[PDB]
Structures are given as C-alpha cells and as structure tokens.
Amino acid sequence: LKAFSKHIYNAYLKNFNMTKKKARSILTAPFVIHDIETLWQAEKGLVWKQLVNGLPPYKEISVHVFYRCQCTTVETVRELTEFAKSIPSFSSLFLNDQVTLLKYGVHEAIFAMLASIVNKDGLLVANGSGFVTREFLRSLRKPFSDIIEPKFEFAVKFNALELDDSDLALFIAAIILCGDRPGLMNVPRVEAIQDTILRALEFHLQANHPDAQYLFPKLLQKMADLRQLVTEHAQMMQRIKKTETETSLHPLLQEIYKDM
C-alpha cells in the first residue's frame, strides 16, 4: 500500500520536468514578460532570432500567446500519457479505454498541475526561465483573455490546500482513472483501479498532512471543480475554433477536442 503511493510518486518524478518543489523555489530570477517588448525578447530560437525585425502588429500578440498555451499543454499531454503507462493496472486496460481516459482526463490533470507554477500575479513558463504576468493576459483580446483568467482564480484556491508533489502524484492518477467518461467500455475495472488509488491517497494525506482534517473530501471537491472548469474551457476553445479563423489547433489538441 505504501509502495503503491511511492510507485506513482516515482513515475511522477520520472515523467514531469516541472515540479511544485522546483516551481516554488523559483517563484519565491525568472525573466518577467509584462509587455509586447519583453514577450518578444523571450526567444533564443535561432530561426526566430534570424527572422525577427520589430514588434508584432496586434492580433499576432494574442495568437502568439494562444500558440504558447497550446505548446505548454501538448508537452504536458505527452508527459501525462507516459505517466499513465506506469500507473498500476492502466496498461492492462483496453487500449481504447486508455485513450478515452486520457482524452477526457488530461486537461483536468494539467490545470491541477499548473496551479503549482502559478501565483496571484502570474505564472512560470518556458522551463521556469520566464514569468508571464497576469496583467498582460488581461491585456490580450477577449476570447484569449476570458480563457486564461478563470484558471488563475481556480489555481489560487487549489494552492490554498498547500499540497506537495507526493499529493499531486496520486491526485492526478485519480483524475485520469475516472469512471464516468463517455464511451468508456470496461467501467468496473476502471472504478476498481480508482478505488485502489483513492485508498492510497486517503492514507497518504493522513501520513503527510496530520493536522489538517477534512482534506480528502476537499480534494474530491476539486475533482468536480476541475470537470466544470474543463467543461467551460472546452466550450470557449470550440467557440474560438469557430470564430478565430486565423487561428488553428495542434493535431494532438484536435483529437482531444473532437467529440466533446
């Protein structure tokens, strides 16, 4: 049982480059991106460096941030996919279920993970090297500003729990191995596996956070909140996909948002 929680926490460490430990040690010399000038200064890309001339028109600023939001999540989706392979019993499931579980579960896992790299004034980006301000994300266009702002307000509430990476490791495994996803075939086997993980998390929270009662149902509450947050996010993404014709979506993201 204890080795179960350390197996997942092992895989978490093995698969996710950015951790809450490394994140909070940075947050408490990142290059601050607070305007169009500093946003462009974050480059280092040799091809980008060879092509840059001046500052971008206006519409390019929001598409660029929207492009960086895609890249962030795409990388994290591929990490979460490996992470899931190491979760006990996940690989024994039907490959369809494995895909279905990841399809509807990755964003919920991401937004909980991304709370680690966030505070009330902004978030860490680009391998912890830069810090994008909240004000700048308010200064973008409405469609792209209205999808970033709900996340900040959730992240600060999630960070009030004062969890660590060993808590997140199990918590994320619980989000992925979720029973009530559309089209999920072998439901009993997934719920069974989730109970094992839920039983592991219940023990871990008591062994890691002694003097903070009622913390488990709090985390269960956040799972329902992560669903509603993603439910709104996906809707705002599809409204964007409809209206924003000069905007496209990464092939990995296209899959996930196909049939939601």
Residues near ligand 3OZ (CB under 6 A): 65-66, 68-70, 72-73, 107, 111, 114, 118, 123, 125-126, 132, 137, 147-148, 151-152, 155, 237, 253
Report the residue number, 215 or 252, with the smaller CB distance to ligand 3OZ. 252
Shortest distance in whole angstroms from residue 250 CB to ligand 3OZ: 7
Nearer to ligand 3OZ, 16 or 66 (CB): 66
| Amino acid, res. 70 | Q
Rounded Cα–Cα distance for residues 172 and 12 (Å): 9
Identify which of 86, 84, 89 has the alpha carbon closest to the alpha carbon of residue 99.
84
Q: Helix (H, G, I), strand (E, B), or coil: what is residue 101?
A: helix
Q: Where are the alpha helices (DSSP H) in 117-259?
A: 134-138, 142-159, 165-176, 187-208, 215-243, 251-257
Q: What's the closest the beta carbon of residue 137 comes to ligand 3OZ, in angstroms? A: 5
Nearest distance from residue 219's CB to ligand 3OZ, in Å?
18
CB of 214 to ligand 3OZ, least distance (A): 25
Residues with Cβ within 8 Å of 214's Cβ and at least 6 positions away in sequence, in order, are none
Of the pair 9, 66, the CB lying nearest ligand 3OZ is at 66
Farthest CA pair distance, the chain: 58
Question: What does the alpha-carbon distance between residue 250 and residue 72 come to, in Å, rounded to a whole number?
Answer: 11
- Residue 179 Cβ vs ligand 3OZ, minimum distance, rounded to whole Å: 23
CB 174 within 8 A of CB 198: yes
Nearer to ligand 3OZ, 68 or 181 (CB): 68
The smaller minimum CB distance to ligand 3OZ, of residues 14 and 78, is found at: 78
> Smallest distance, Å, CB 113 to ligand 3OZ?
9
Cβ closest to ligand 3OZ, residue 20 vs residue 107: 107
Residue written as tokens 């839920």? Answer: 198
